[PDB]
Design a protein around this ligand. Structure first.
Ligand SMILES: *C(=O)c1cnc2ccccc2n1
Ligand SMILES: *C(=O)c1cnc2ccccc2n1
Ligand SMILES: *C(=O)c1cnc2ccccc2n1
Ligand SMILES: *C(=O)c1cnc2ccccc2n1
Ligand SMILES: [Mn+2]
Ligand SMILES: [Mn+2]
Lengths: 8, 8
DNA sequence: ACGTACGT
DNA sequence: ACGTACGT
């Protein structure tokens, strides 16, 4: 759920 | 992510 | 269930 | 002169 590199 | 010239 | 982020 | 960055 976090988006820092994918943002699921 | 390394920073040795840009640091991203 | 998911990888993005640069230049001296 | 090289890899760090999170939870809905
Ligand atoms: C977001 O909160 C989140 C948490 N755990 C994960 C595990 C695997 C893929 C994506 C995920 N996203
Ligand atoms: C994004 O591509 C990405 C990859 N790995 C991680 C590990 C820990 C926190 C955040 C991350 N983000
Ligand atoms: C940092 O770990 C890192 C890794 N690969 C990259 C590629 C392109 C721009 C920035 C990057 N940063
Ligand atoms: C910084 O500007 C920079 C440019 N190219 C590189 C190549 C290899 C290692 C580190 C680098 N840093
Ligand atoms: Mn991963
Ligand atoms: Mn987790």
């Amino acid at each position: 759920x976090a988006x820092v590199x994918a943002x699921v």
